[PDB]
Amino acid sequence: AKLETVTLGNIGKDGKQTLVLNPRGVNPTNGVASLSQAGAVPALEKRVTVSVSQPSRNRKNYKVQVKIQNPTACTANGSCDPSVTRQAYADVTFSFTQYSTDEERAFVRTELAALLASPLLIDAIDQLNPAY
Amino acid sequence: AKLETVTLGNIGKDGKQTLVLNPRGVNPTNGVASLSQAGAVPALEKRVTVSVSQPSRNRKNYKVQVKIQNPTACTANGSCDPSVTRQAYADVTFSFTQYSTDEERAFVRTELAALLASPLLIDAIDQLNPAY
Amino acid sequence: AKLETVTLGNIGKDGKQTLVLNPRGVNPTNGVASLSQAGAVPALEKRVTVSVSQPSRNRKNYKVQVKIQNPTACTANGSCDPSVTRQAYADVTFSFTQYSTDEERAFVRTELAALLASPLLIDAIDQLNPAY
Amino acid sequence: AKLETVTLGNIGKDGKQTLVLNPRGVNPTNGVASLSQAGAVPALEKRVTVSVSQPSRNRKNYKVQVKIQNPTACTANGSCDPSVTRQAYADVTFSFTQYSTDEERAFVRTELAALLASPLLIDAIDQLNPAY
Amino acid sequence: AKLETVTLGNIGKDGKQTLVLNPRGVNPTNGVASLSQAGAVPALEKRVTVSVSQPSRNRKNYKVQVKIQNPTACTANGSCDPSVTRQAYADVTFSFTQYSTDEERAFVRTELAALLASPLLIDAIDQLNPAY
Amino acid sequence: AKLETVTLGNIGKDGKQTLVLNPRGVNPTNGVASLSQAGAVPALEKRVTVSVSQPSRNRKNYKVQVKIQNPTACTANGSCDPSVTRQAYADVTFSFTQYSTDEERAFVRTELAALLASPLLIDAIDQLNPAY
């Protein structure tokens, strides 16, 4: 990565749609890669922001982070320009020790993806169901 | 949503192992369940903690958080007690408003699992190679 | 050079529209051509300007500058007049040394037109879209 | 955007030559596209680069900046080695609002290509004729 | 000249060792490419960094610079965590004239590799002193 | 590490070139050994020089300075005093601790020569740096 385009498929409530984010680029103060929705509305686009520490000494207990932004907008009466009335977010971090291996980093990655995909969280999030 | 066990299949570097979590120690203060490997001490070491959000009050929105902790164990000779260091962690959160819908929630979480499975994050996590 | 109505055919993302900017004149304040389309208010909005800077005592080489003004307008309320909320524009400079010739002057114009036609700028402008 | 070799054909005084600008890696410290006549000595090299940026601190619009350079050298100017004697450049900046469509952004891009081909600029640029 | 996996071989004291370097991408902090071995395993740092410099307005220095970091660790008896006691380094810089060509630049690089492998430089640091 | 004439071959971008440098003795004030060209004018000679030591009170550790100087000149802007013209230059610094082993030093020398011989750097010093 090296990614010219990022496509997430099998998404949405029924697991049937796709989202294409194109890289905008990498931010040269932050060292942060940034993707956003391929649709032509810069004002109102889905975004993914990605960072990994060098690691530097104070970032040796390194972070890998992805920020997810999904605004929802509509057009107000009397305004040709649409705007966001609600926003949805997610924020995921790893890892953090310098002595972790790719295998452990992956377990955390997948013990996560496999949980996000599990009914516990599907209903705890989609219907705001307390666990009991 | 329910304090049922979770089978996290298809996990690890190649997506081929399984870990099973069993919820316990739910703290009524905040409705947060500790999901962990069932049995002995590893049950205390390898765990995922899951909160469930509820709308409004603080404020006109809500937040969901899951904490992942996977410690590395070893022990001194003659010790009565093993210990863990070089611990792997992750944190995933979600944020939505009080008027949010199920469809926008589904995209934020369904993307996220698809996003974790994307080379974007596989490289950012497994190698620590950000998409540069 | 001498002004005449400039008709720009085959324009817009689909290459189907035509813009017609009449040779209103040249502003003697600064030697700037004024080309516009057509109405009492719209001609003050849809505009192209042109000027030439000759080599000079300020130890300057020569250049040609072209400005593109493409504002649009939206809604109106009880105050009744419409207004511009958005504007697309460009500032186009052609820079040459004092001994530069016609061939070089022509290459810069045509290379740019070829580049504007090329996918690199189709995507830089229609999409996000910085390199990568 | 994505880089690939661009062949800027139908260029120059008679509209008959081609520049073949091969992709160069994109340096993240600015995210600038770089295509060039790579067989050239770097002090000569004919090159096209594109800089694209999003709104940020002190910046409200989206911008695309295009730089075209064509230095020309004398192969052996009383020497054995080439030395640049002539230079010619394009420096074009485009600017768009965040809420904007591709159709609209494209008009400024396409209008310029159509404009570059106009008799007004053929004379304003190739003969360096002032407006009149 | 591009991000790629680099495999070395026929290296080491007996000339029989191999090494594979997995890229980290290009770091926006300074626009510099880097690659490391596993790269997840060498928690104690095994790295190669490659510049990527530009013929800047204030320098015209588009040099190639490669930095090599090779630590050696000691295990503190019954330790769960090994640590570096020695660090070896190498730093190679290639300085160029702006009118230089590929064969000129290659003469120096190929000359250097041929020299590093020569008995004179091998003896000076394998066992001895400044040459005599 | 006695200086003796060093003959290099299989050098240049195509690996088709030789170079012979003869000992000129050693600079006694800094231990900088030198291999000279067989010509009459030092200004235009290709040469290689070397010195290795651990300073008594700038220590740190042991470092070696390996330097390549390749001046170029031509008689057209000559023939008298055909000055430089395409100067090429490179060097290597290596450093080791007092405990570095014999194989450690060998490893680093060979790792570097193997990298210099790698396609990554073969192309980096030529027409394109690994900006991406």
Numbering used by the authors:
A (entry chain M), B (entry chain F), C (entry chain O), D (entry chain H), E (entry chain K), F (entry chain D): 1 to 132
Structure paper excerpt:
The coat proteins (CPs) of single-stranded RNA bacteriophages (ssRNA phages) directly assemble around the genomic RNA (gRNA) to form a near-icosahedral capsid with a single maturation protein (Mat) that binds the gRNA and interacts with the retractile pilus during infection of the host. The canonical ssRNA phage Qβ has a genomic RNA (gRNA) of 4217 nucleotides, from the 5′ to the 3′ end, encoding the maturation protein (Mat); the major coat protein (CP); the minor capsid protein A1, which is a read-through extension caused by a leaky stop codon for the major CP; and the β-subunit of the RNA-dependent RNA replicase (Rep). Through a native infection without engineering the amino acid sequences, we found that Qβ CP can form diverse VLP capsids, including the T = 3 icosahedral, T = 4 icosahedral, prolate, oblate, and a small prolate form elongated along the 3-fold axis.
Although the number of T = 4 or prolate particles does not increase, to our surprise, almost a quarter of the VLPs purified by the modified protocol are smaller than T = 3 particles. One is the oblate form with T = 3 and Q = 2; the other is a small prolate form elongated along the 3-fold axis from the two T = 1 caps. When produced from an infection event, and purified via size-exclusion chromatography, the population of the oblate and the small prolate forms are around 21% and 3%, respectively. When over-expressing the gene containing only the cp and read-through (referred to as A1) fraction of the Qβ genome from a plasmid, the percentage of the oblate and small prolate forms increase further to 35% and 12%, respectively. The “over arched” type, which provides more curvature with a θ angle of ~130°, includes hexamers from the oblate and small prolate VLPs. For example, one can convert an oblate capsid to a T = 3 capsid by separating the two end-shells from the equator and adding five more hexamers where the two half-shells rejoin.
